[PDB]
Amino acid sequence: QIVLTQSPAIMSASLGERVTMTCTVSSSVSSGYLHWYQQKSGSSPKLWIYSTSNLASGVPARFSGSGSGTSYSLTISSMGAEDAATYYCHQYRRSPLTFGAGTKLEIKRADAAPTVSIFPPSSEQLTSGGASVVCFLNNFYPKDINVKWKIDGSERQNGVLNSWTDQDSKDSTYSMSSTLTLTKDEYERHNSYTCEATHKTSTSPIVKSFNRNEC
């Protein structure tokens, strides 16, 4: 079983910067059999670099591939706005056909603070029997962020559901949704619900809270 280790698995780069990816195979393959592919969100992969150093039909000249034996590289001379995607290296000289782990190339912007917004469960949902406390964390950077839920100052482990958006096309920021869900009887037995966010751009964690007894 040939393995294709891809590193770095996560890369941030600004416009004009130069990035370099790596794939190290477990057994030396001929250079003519390793290929690179680019895949954007919601789209099928596209042959990018084939036979290591040959760019496919249409991919820009700022791309290049090098390597031989065990190590292989993919280098972008000038980071463009359209090159933010996930890249894979591919081999089928020996069975089984294996892809690399995948390198996530994110474009880098200035640091941004998350605009946190917390919402109590609506009056309509309480009629049904559920209680979901949604806490939005929109437009921030980088993606590294930790969201914790506290019920009356006590951290809660269950019911927390999260979802991240992709890097926005306009501002290159990220957004996250946090939904704390629990029963109606468990909701009416507690008062202060705290949505706390820990981010790189905050010395102290941003605290958004509300009270069930203030209306």
Place this chain on the structure above:
Amino acid sequence: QVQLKESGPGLVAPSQSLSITCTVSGFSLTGYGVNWVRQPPGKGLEWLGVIWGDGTTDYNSTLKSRLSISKDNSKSQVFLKMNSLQTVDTARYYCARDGDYGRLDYWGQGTTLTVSSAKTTPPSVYPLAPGSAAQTNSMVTLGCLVKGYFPEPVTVTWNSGSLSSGVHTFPAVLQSDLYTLSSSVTVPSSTWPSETVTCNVAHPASSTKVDKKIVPRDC
């Protein structure tokens, strides 16, 4: 030119058989191989198998028990059959040509496969509005919670598409055999609740449309 198009059932129940047809064009299947590559939601490319131009097959080591790949050279069709589909078989299944030196030069659009025993369920749309408390800034954040629906997709728009900027529609998350989607919008305090803000949730699989007027909570 070279084309590939896979035809899948889309939604199957667990412990059921699978049959996907990969209609190709532009080349002859006798001189090119065709690989099957599935991709789980939010994961990397995962190889399934391959059928060569001469009819020989090579499969994924852990899936040879269930996987089976045949083809039809005259009709330019490659077939992918699976047995005892588990819930974790949900992915987007591609078929790609095995070109010079094994390059996957031409891919298909891929077909989404969902493996779940969940019955079709329309979502319970909920309005997300702040209390009658203090504004954060010139802008207020409004949202909608699209909870508990099956299957995907769901169309979420604001003010019938008029309100587009400041909208963040988060990808759905399977809580427990049901999808839950969140979407927020940021508007100036001069707009809400002066104007009317309403999110439009459309669940095609249930033929359900919902329009929830975002009204401030009352203290």
Place this chain on the structure above:
Amino acid sequence: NTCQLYIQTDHLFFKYYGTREAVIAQISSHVKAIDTIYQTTDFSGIRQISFMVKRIRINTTADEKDPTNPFRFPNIGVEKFLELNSEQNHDDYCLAYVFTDRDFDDGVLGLAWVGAPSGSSGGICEKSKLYSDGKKKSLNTGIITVQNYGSHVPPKVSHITFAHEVGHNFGSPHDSGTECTPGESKNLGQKENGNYIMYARATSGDKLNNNKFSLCSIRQISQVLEKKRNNCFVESGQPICGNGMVEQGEECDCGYSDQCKDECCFDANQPEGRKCKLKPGKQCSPSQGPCCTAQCAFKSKSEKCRDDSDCAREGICNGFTALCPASDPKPQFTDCNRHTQVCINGQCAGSICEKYGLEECTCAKELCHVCCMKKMDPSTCASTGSVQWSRHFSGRTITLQPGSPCNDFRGYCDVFMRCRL
């Protein structure tokens, strides 16, 4: 320098060797034979000249029941056998040969068209022309057979017989005169060397003057080259994928799409990088060698790669590679070819006379008898049943096998012990 050959084999040639790998190994060694013979010969055109095969066609015994195959008839004359091969379209190849296992009358082994340097047609460098009688034949053809007078010929004579008829293709007639046929010379120094390739009669085993062309043949081939190879021959380069032989740069070679029945090899119609390459998960291909099965695996131990021969002990497969283990000899000086020659280090050459320090000689109904001699003196040439060698042979008169040269290479001995010229 390199001329793209097209070699065919009928079902008689396939039935004798008994798999497709065995006949392919025979035609691979025949091309490399005339490759080495012509390269080591100084021709007037260029200092070197080699050969290359472009495609093969192995007809099996299943083709004997094919009504469209005109080679299925067991009784086919050597002239009509070459006419059948001509009637095909061979414009993609400089030459086209067909190997068979037929016993042609009067000791005929090979037959090919004579190559004219100009003013005629046939031999090397001829495209299909209309001619007369309305059949479009390709006169760039030749035939060979490996059986003569009910006896299979050894590969050394079989490889040379290829180079003989190819000489006529290259424009060389038969050798004539004393200056180019030293076998009939009245000088012991020239007679020991023997005749040349283009000798008109039987040849076997002299191996010095017979393996390469003559001063006469070089002159006649010189004109065909200087005027036809410029427009006929092609370049030297990397070996092509699809000729059924495993060359350097490729791991396997089963043929094209309509020829490849190998589940271990991508055919020649596959894209670059995988054509003539081993399929993933497979570790061999029968095209590499006889020591590996159709299930793509180095063969198990104690299986016949090479069978026990007269002068060669059996080579036996195991899983170290796809090839035979090189065969090794049994006790030295054993009798081979039915007491006609000896076994010394893996070859059945020479004669039985060399077993007791003697040399073969031409007797003087007794021509198909083995006449030995005291060394260096042809006046001491006596039969194996003579009173001179009665101490060794004890009297038994060893007779020459059918299809053996006799009477100073003027003919063969038949099954009735007659030296037929």
